Paper text:
The CorA/Mrs2 family of pentameric proteins are cardinal for the influx of Mg2+ across cellular membranes, importing the cation to mitochondria in eukaryotes. The mitochondrial inner membrane protein Mrs2 (mitochondrial RNA-splicing protein 2) is responsible for regulating the Mg2+ concentrations of mitochondria in eukaryotes, providing controlled uptake of the ion14–16. CorA/Mrs2 forms homopentamers with two transmembrane (TM) helices (TM1 and TM2) in each monomer, which are preceded by a soluble N-terminal domain (NTD) that regulates the Mg2+ passage. The protein family exposes only the loop between TM1 and TM2 to the surrounding environment but this stretch harbors a conserved selective filter GMN motif that is essential for permeation.
We first maintained Mg2+ in all procedures during sample preparation. The final reconstructed map reached an average resolution of 3.1 Å in the absence of imposed symmetry. Finally, two additional features of the cryo-EM density in the pore are assigned as Mg2+ ions, the first located at T434 (glycine in hMrs2) and the second positioned at the conserved T427. Three more constriction regions of the pore follow P2, marked by D420 (asparagine in hMrs2), the conserved M417–R413 pair that is positioned at the membrane interface to the matrix and the R406 (phenylalanine in hMrs2)–D410 (invariant) pair. Nonetheless, the combination of invariant positively charged residues at R413 and a hydrophobic or positively charged lock for cations at R406, along with the small diameters at these constrictions (4.0 and 2.0 Å, respectively, representing the narrowest parts of the permeation pathway), indicates that the CtMrs2 structure is closed. The cryo-EM density reveals the presence of four more putative Mg2+-binding sites per monomer, present as a ‘glue’ in between separate polypeptides in the soluble fraction of CtMrs2. One pair of these sites (M1 and M2; M for the matrix of the mitochondria) are positioned at the tip of the protein. The second pair of putative Mg2+-binding sites (here denoted M3 and M4) are located in between the stalk helix of one monomer and helix α5 of the adjacent monomer. In the closed state, Mg2+ ions bind between the NTDs of separate monomers (positions M1 and M4 or M1–M4 in CtMrs2), thereby assisting in stabilizing the symmetrical shape, and to distinct positions of the pore (U, S, P1 and P2). At elevated Mg2+ concentrations in the matrix, Mrs2 is stabilized in a closed configuration through Mg2+ that bridges the monomers, two of which (sites M1 and M4) are conserved in Mrs2, including hMrs2.
Author numbering:
A (entry chain C), B (entry chain B), C (entry chain A), D (entry chain E), E (entry chain D): 166 to 482
Write the structure that this text describes.
């Protein structure tokens, strides 16, 4: 029933750092509906909701409520502001307290807040992609030559992480594109003009459209890069899978030569041991039996080995 | 020709728990068509049908007919109300008998019933996902290190279940989105106003659209989670498939050393048994033949083993 | 140039069972075009064509021409009516000869014929799915435990059949959806009103739309069931493919123990046969050489076997 | 700068067979643009372009320019008319020189030319599919039982050809559908009426739409057939891939029995050769040592073989 | 804060080759927005942006700003103009300084610049495809017969390159199609007319649409060619993967014959060595024991080899 909240007024000055806010006041004086509170509490789906007097943004690490005179950043009650959140808060305060008075390119409060939010989200996405891209190239280069046991596990660890990052980037891009495809939602975001009884209409929304298209393309570029990386990983895996079976056949063929050699040696040993029996061979007292038998055994071994090698060469041809 | 029916009147009071209803009365006094009855009897396709005076909802475990003054929950004649059905009935009764009189955020009878129906469906989907997600992480962690025989069967059992749950969630999300994409269907659901000769029109349907979008996003989140889980399972399977062939080559290479050792031993044994024949060797009575022959056999075995090992190292290089 | 035709007049009475019809009369007095005849002769693509005074339906086993006062069922000249065709004809005759006069839910001749056609097509699709689904579960259950040679062939026979049935169901669903997406085609199917100089218009087509949506959903359900079955088959195949390689490694590892045993036996036999040569061993007349040599050979065999087993355990670790 | 051209005037009479035409006259007196000439020279992408006074068709083997009073068929300067081109020219001449005067179903010059072009393209596509379909069934039937070396190469040759034909058919179907999806392009093809200061408008294009839909469906049917064939090929490949590993395990298991037999024989031979040493065995002069030792060796061989077989049966269980 | 810039005035004369330009002047006097500068600095996503008074093009190697009287080509500050950039600049200068005065087919300054830009991009894409296509056919032809170790690595190197080129071509085609799908963007590109207080409107954009469609189709053709090449590579890989396992079984079966031969030789050697023991055989002094024992051993070896071969033939059947 409580949330940690940081509040900024219309002058860009922080009046609350890590205060506690009851979700009842959100319905009371912020134009929200009772059914939207459960989206604020716990939701990992990036989205942008346009209300008659407020804008709700849930993008990765940012949960923001933007009005024409106030900005709220909320999160779980028990927590502390992270470094990206502090950097975003500093940038938003600096951009809001500019108090500039330009000409044609002047932007209101809510658009200046949305621009900072989108820039922070895009910067975080780019940083995450740069942090995740580095090990993949190294492990692919290491797997180019040899295939070990632990490198496959490293590739397994990296592939799912890359796929999850690509899915998150696609979700953010689709969340932006969904808002980019509604004319009434684009027209209803002019909160400053609605406070002066001025309504824009569903056909004059150039500024917000131009603001959103740039970040849409920025997210699309990272999505394409992640898709290319995934395709490269898939190709490398599909090639090494066949490389394994290609290099196994070398050992499979090498074993047969040793098998043929053992067969020839056994064939020679059979005839060598035939004459070792305690029987009558009729040539025991001769002076030529030993050399003749040795030569016959050697010739038989050689011819059987040659026949085996010839048959192997014919088969493998 | 009979169905089990639970009835709630316009005051939120239950007047029938598990009564029997003939399908003829549905056509008689509920604004249904004769061809829709077969959808009520047996259908596993989630859908929402908008009639001039009634709304038909078939979502998983809920078969509901909603009017401006009555609510019916129907199912097969021979059955009993389940725990989710009883919880949904209790929640619907509690929300209907509130008798609240709000301001701008007041909702009619049919919208209050539809909100409870959608909340029950989303809660059941979330519970099913939480129940199905747990074993997958454990079996993936167990398969990270070693690959057994039964763990693959467990993964087979879990994968099809996860895919079926993802398909069911996608079907529910698409059923909601189909209703979200029709302006006339959205405009025709204002049943309370049509009883006072007041018609809304195809351009003023803000309340029902805002009601439906939240549950659409709630279903989309679970769909994305299931898709991520399926992708992780696929990556793990594709990696272990190559891990098997990677670890087989170690034994394939280890066998060749034993083969070379056996070949060397056979080569030595051939010469050892050559001198065991009952023939004339001319060095039987000498005092140096035994050691010389033993040394020659040992040297031949050693050199053939060394040549085999060198050839194996050259091949595997 | 001839077709087998069955004709039903406006009163639901059959006047021709298996007559012969020349395709020229179709252009002469049925409002067809010369280029459509080739679709009637031989075409396996389900479609529905709307003409200014006729409707042409080609759905699986039905080739029907529907007018406001006549119904034709045509097929190849040399053939006989099948059992599904006879059942469809009986149902159509029974529904047409009802001569009922209802109130708000009264339907004209062409709509009553189209409803029967769609019901017959959906019933045949459901029967085909029920006939094709049964063997798949049994063969998957049989393949859950053991993988034989003929069961894989049975799975091969069943998979292509299931895929073809799913493709046919998707084609029928898309053929229905194509007609459901044209306002002018929906408006031009009111053939009865066009005979009284009454034209409906592209914005009042509630009856035919409601009639078609039910059968569209009926086909979609069978499509989803077939898709689920295909996914289950794919998962089972992808799991058994890895099960094979998982169970091969057991025999691959078991062979090495026998190899080590043979190596140890050969090592022992070498020393056993070294002392069998007809040379001077200097310990032939002693009373301790035999036992000493036997013990040395046994110890050498045991230690080499132990070293081989230890190396195998270290490698497989 | 030159093309081979065949010209037909408005009366259906050929005045040029294989003449030479400079591409400058196409811009001069045919309503083409300078940037379109490069599409006429060399392009393998089927397309239909609608000009204010001409129609350009590039479909497979046909490069045609159609006007309200003239038809041109062009190709590379150095070439000769093929048999399909000659058949198309004969059919077009025969259809143009009919000089028929019908009633409601009368078609102008350009529509009569387009109908012949589309019929020729569809006939050629059907002939190509019929020529490519035949060997696939035979090779699949041959691979159903046994898997050889050359049959896999034949399947490799056929699969890419089938995929390329399917891609070409899909490209033709998409080229037709692109023209079918533009109202202004459909309205601008009434070249005959534009010569009498009569303009049709983007809402009256029934004739050309009905003409194009038939050939669109004709191409879609062949696309579906090719897709079914590709799916069957994929299923057959995925099944034989597992059949190979299924039948390898039989030989893998059969080798172990021979290994156990060799181990038992070696175990027996070790004890047989232990008593062959030239040492003192103390039972040389007895009349029972020979049979006892033979029986002991045989029993040891039998028991070790039995233990090996039992262990193998336990492992394979 | 600086970029390398080449400038061309309205007469087609170059006044700056490799000058330095500060990005502030782009906002000052070129109609750009402060948020677009980061797209000019570093972006690999091809896009076309339409401004009220300028057009920004980022296509591969071209970063161009087009106005009604000036053309800028910009890139990183530290760099030099490449050969494609110089060729594009020469072609653009030649086309701009034509000073032609045509009739109906006259084009303004910005359209003449855009045509040259698109022609250069298409020519570079075609050249890249022609350079990348050649090695693939050769390596596929080499892999058709035999499968080596390095050829698989070459295929791995080529496959990812082909996929990346296909992705780049698809990105360029989609970038063109995105501009082709906006009526307001097409209408706002008439910069010359807007300088004379003449506005076109969202319904008269024939010239630019016809200009863009040709290059859209040109890119689509290369996309289709790349897709066909990728499909061929995938089919070849999937076939050689099974070819490997098909040819392994030949050696697997050949090893068993040698195993059976060794088993038979061992069986014969066992009986040959049984009679070599120093025991009483009772047939030592006979004149028939030697031949009888030799024949018995040979017959036993032959019968066991025959039984093994018969069992192998029965198993492999
Ligand atoms: Mg993952
Ligand atoms: Mg807009
Ligand atoms: Mg825009
Ligand atoms: Mg890629
Ligand atoms: Mg021996
Ligand atoms: Mg499943
Ligand atoms: Mg709306
Ligand atoms: Mg909305
Ligand atoms: Mg994912
Ligand atoms: Mg051996
Ligand atoms: Mg199939
Ligand atoms: Mg409608
Ligand atoms: Mg509807
Ligand atoms: Mg499924
Ligand atoms: Mg191919
Ligand atoms: Mg139309
Ligand atoms: Mg139509
Ligand atoms: Mg299929
Ligand atoms: Mg001896
Ligand atoms: Mg002796
Ligand atoms: Mg790649
Ligand atoms: Mg247009
Ligand atoms: Mg156009
Ligand atoms: Mg292809």
């Amino acid at each position: 029933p409580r949330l940690r909240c940081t509040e900024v007024d219309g002058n860009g000055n922080v009046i609350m750092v890590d205060g506690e806010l009851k979700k009842s006041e959100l319905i009371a004086k912020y134009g929200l509906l009772p059914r939207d509170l459960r989206k604020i509490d716990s939701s990992n789906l990036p989205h942008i909701l346009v209300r008659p007097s407020a804008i709700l943004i849930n993008l990765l690490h940012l949960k923001v409520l933007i009005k024409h005179d106030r900005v709220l950043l909320f999160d779980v009650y028990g927590s502390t502001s992270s470094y990206p959140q502090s950097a975003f808060m500093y940038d938003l305060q600096g951009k809001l307290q500019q108090k500039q008075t330009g000409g044609a390119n002047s932007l209101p409060y809510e658009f200046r807040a949305l621009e900072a939010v989108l820039m922070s989200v895009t910067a975080e996405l780019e940083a995450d992609f740069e942090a995740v891209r580095d090990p993949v190239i190294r492990i692919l280069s290491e797997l180019e030559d040899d295939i070990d046991r632990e490198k496959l596990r490293i590739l397994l660890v990296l592939s799912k992480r890359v796929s999850t990052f690509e899915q998150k980037a696609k979700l953010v891009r689709d969340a932006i594109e969904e808002l980019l495809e509604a004319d009434d939602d684009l027209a209803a975001m002019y909160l400053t003009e609605k406070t002066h009884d001025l309504y824009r209409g569903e056909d004059d929304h150039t500024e917000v459209e131009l603001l959103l298209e740039s970040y849409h393309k920025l997210c699309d570029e990272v999505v394409q890069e992640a898709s290319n990386l995934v395709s490269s990983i898939r190709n490398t895996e599909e090639i090494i899978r066949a490389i394994l079976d290609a290099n196994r056949n070398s050992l499979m063929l090498l074993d047969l030569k040793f098998s043929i050699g053992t067969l020839g040696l056994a064939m020679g040993t059979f005839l060598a041991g035939l004459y070792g029996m305690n029987l009558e061979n009729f040539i025991e007292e001769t002076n030529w039996g030993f050399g003749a038998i040795t030569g016959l055994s050697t010739l038989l071994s050689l011819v059987v080995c040659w026949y085996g090698l010839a048959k192997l060469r014919k088969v493998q041809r």
